[PDB]
Amino acid sequence: WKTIKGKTWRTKQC
Amino acid sequence: SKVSEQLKCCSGILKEMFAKKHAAYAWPFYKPVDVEALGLHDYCDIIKHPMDMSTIKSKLEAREYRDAQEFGADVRLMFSNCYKYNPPDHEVVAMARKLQDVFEMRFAKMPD
Ligand SMILES: [N]
Protein backbone atom coordinates (compact mmCIF):
# COMPACT_ATOMS: atom_id res chain seq x y z
CA TRP A 1 0.00 0.00 0.00
CA LYS A 2 0.99 3.64 -0.50
CA THR A 3 -0.24 6.95 0.92
CA ILE A 4 0.69 10.36 -0.48
CA LYS A 5 -1.04 13.56 0.62
CA GLY A 6 -4.10 11.73 1.87
CA LYS A 7 -4.33 9.62 -1.27
CA THR A 8 -4.14 6.00 -0.21
CA TRP A 9 -4.10 3.16 -2.75
CA ARG A 10 -2.80 -0.37 -3.26
CA THR A 11 -0.13 -0.78 -5.94
CA LYS A 12 -0.43 -3.34 -8.73
CA GLN A 13 2.57 -5.13 -7.26
CA CYS A 14 0.93 -5.75 -3.89
CA SER B 1 9.22 41.20 -27.61
CA LYS B 2 12.00 39.47 -25.68
CA VAL B 3 9.47 39.13 -22.86
CA SER B 4 6.92 37.66 -25.28
CA GLU B 5 9.35 34.97 -26.45
CA GLN B 6 10.29 34.18 -22.84
CA LEU B 7 6.63 33.67 -21.91
CA LYS B 8 6.30 31.30 -24.87
CA CYS B 9 9.14 29.21 -23.42
CA CYS B 10 7.41 29.21 -20.03
CA SER B 11 4.42 27.50 -21.66
CA GLY B 12 6.67 24.79 -23.10
CA ILE B 13 8.41 24.31 -19.76
CA LEU B 14 5.04 23.85 -18.04
CA LYS B 15 3.96 21.56 -20.89
CA GLU B 16 6.92 19.27 -20.18
CA MET B 17 6.06 19.38 -16.47
CA PHE B 18 2.60 18.09 -17.45
CA ALA B 19 4.08 15.44 -19.76
CA LYS B 20 3.88 11.72 -19.02
CA LYS B 21 7.69 11.61 -18.80
CA HIS B 22 7.44 13.20 -15.33
CA ALA B 23 3.93 12.08 -14.32
CA ALA B 24 5.29 9.64 -11.72
CA TYR B 25 6.47 12.56 -9.55
CA ALA B 26 4.59 15.59 -10.94
CA TRP B 27 1.00 14.47 -10.27
CA PRO B 28 0.76 15.96 -6.72
CA PHE B 29 1.16 19.40 -8.34
CA TYR B 30 -1.31 19.11 -11.24
CA LYS B 31 -4.44 20.32 -9.41
CA PRO B 32 -4.79 22.51 -6.31
CA VAL B 33 -4.03 20.76 -3.03
CA ASP B 34 -7.14 18.83 -1.95
CA VAL B 35 -7.63 20.10 1.60
CA GLU B 36 -10.54 17.66 2.02
CA ALA B 37 -8.12 14.71 2.08
CA LEU B 38 -7.19 12.86 5.26
CA GLY B 39 -4.33 14.53 7.11
CA LEU B 40 -4.52 17.81 5.15
CA HIS B 41 -6.97 19.56 7.49
CA ASP B 42 -4.29 22.08 8.53
CA TYR B 43 -2.96 22.97 5.07
CA CYS B 44 -4.67 26.36 4.77
CA ASP B 45 -3.39 27.21 8.26
CA ILE B 46 0.25 26.62 7.26
CA ILE B 47 0.15 27.58 3.56
CA LYS B 48 -1.11 31.14 3.06
CA HIS B 49 -0.75 31.25 -0.75
CA PRO B 50 -1.56 27.93 -2.46
CA MET B 51 -0.29 27.34 -5.98
CA ASP B 52 -0.47 24.49 -8.49
CA MET B 53 0.36 23.77 -12.12
CA SER B 54 -3.23 24.17 -13.33
CA THR B 55 -3.41 27.67 -11.83
CA ILE B 56 -0.07 28.56 -13.44
CA LYS B 57 -1.40 27.35 -16.79
CA SER B 58 -4.65 29.30 -16.33
CA LYS B 59 -2.72 32.52 -15.67
CA LEU B 60 -0.48 31.86 -18.67
CA GLU B 61 -3.54 31.52 -20.91
CA ALA B 62 -5.03 34.67 -19.37
CA ARG B 63 -1.61 36.35 -19.85
CA GLU B 64 -1.50 37.52 -16.23
CA TYR B 65 2.27 37.04 -16.01
CA ARG B 66 4.10 40.18 -17.11
CA ASP B 67 7.53 38.57 -17.57
CA ALA B 68 9.09 35.13 -17.16
CA GLN B 69 10.34 35.90 -13.64
CA GLU B 70 6.78 36.26 -12.35
CA PHE B 71 6.04 32.85 -13.88
CA GLY B 72 9.02 31.31 -12.09
CA ALA B 73 7.99 32.96 -8.83
CA ASP B 74 4.71 31.04 -8.89
CA VAL B 75 6.41 27.78 -9.90
CA ARG B 76 8.83 28.17 -6.98
CA LEU B 77 5.94 29.18 -4.72
CA MET B 78 4.37 25.84 -5.64
CA PHE B 79 7.47 23.95 -4.49
CA SER B 80 8.03 26.15 -1.43
CA ASN B 81 4.52 25.38 -0.18
CA CYS B 82 5.40 21.68 -0.39
CA TYR B 83 8.72 22.18 1.42
CA LYS B 84 7.07 24.23 4.18
CA TYR B 85 4.01 22.06 4.85
CA ASN B 86 5.38 18.55 4.42
CA PRO B 87 8.00 16.98 6.68
CA PRO B 88 11.40 16.59 5.00
CA ASP B 89 11.47 12.79 5.00
CA HIS B 90 8.11 12.53 3.21
CA GLU B 91 7.98 11.14 -0.32
CA VAL B 92 6.18 14.20 -1.73
CA VAL B 93 9.17 16.35 -0.79
CA ALA B 94 11.43 14.06 -2.83
CA MET B 95 8.98 14.30 -5.73
CA ALA B 96 9.11 18.10 -5.47
CA ARG B 97 12.91 18.10 -5.78
CA LYS B 98 12.73 15.97 -8.93
CA LEU B 99 10.11 18.19 -10.58
CA GLN B 100 11.89 21.38 -9.49
CA ASP B 101 15.15 20.03 -10.91
CA VAL B 102 13.40 19.62 -14.27
CA PHE B 103 12.05 23.17 -13.96
CA GLU B 104 15.27 24.90 -12.86
CA MET B 105 17.26 23.25 -15.66
CA ARG B 106 14.75 24.32 -18.32
CA PHE B 107 14.20 27.74 -16.73
CA ALA B 108 17.94 28.45 -16.64
CA LYS B 109 18.21 28.09 -20.44
CA MET B 110 15.74 30.92 -21.02
CA PRO B 111 16.49 32.93 -24.19
CA ASP B 112 18.21 36.20 -23.31
N1 LIG C 1 -1.11 -6.25 -5.38
Residue numbers in the entry:
A (entry chain B): 1 to 14
B (entry chain A): 348 to 459
Quote the study's own text:
Within this class of proteins, the bromodomain and extraterminal domain (BET) family contains four members that are transcriptional coregulators and that recognize acetyllysines (AcKs) using a tandem pair of highly homologous bromodomains (BDs). Crystal structures of 13 distinct peptide–bromodomain complexes revealed highly diverse structures and binding modes among the cyclic peptide ligands.
In contrast to our observations for peptide 3.1C, where selectivity between BD1- and BD2-type domains appears to derive from contacts in a region distal to the AcK pocket, the 3.1B peptide recognizes the BD2 domain in a very different manner. The peptide and BD form a 1:1 complex in which it is AcK5 that is bound in the pocket (cf. AcK12 in interactions with BD1 domains). Furthermore, CSPs observed upon addition of 3.1B to 15N-labeled BRD2-BD2 are consistent with this binding mode, indicating that this peptide binds to all BD2 domains in the same manner. This difference again highlights the ability of RaPID-selected peptides to robustly distinguish BD1- from BD2-type domains.
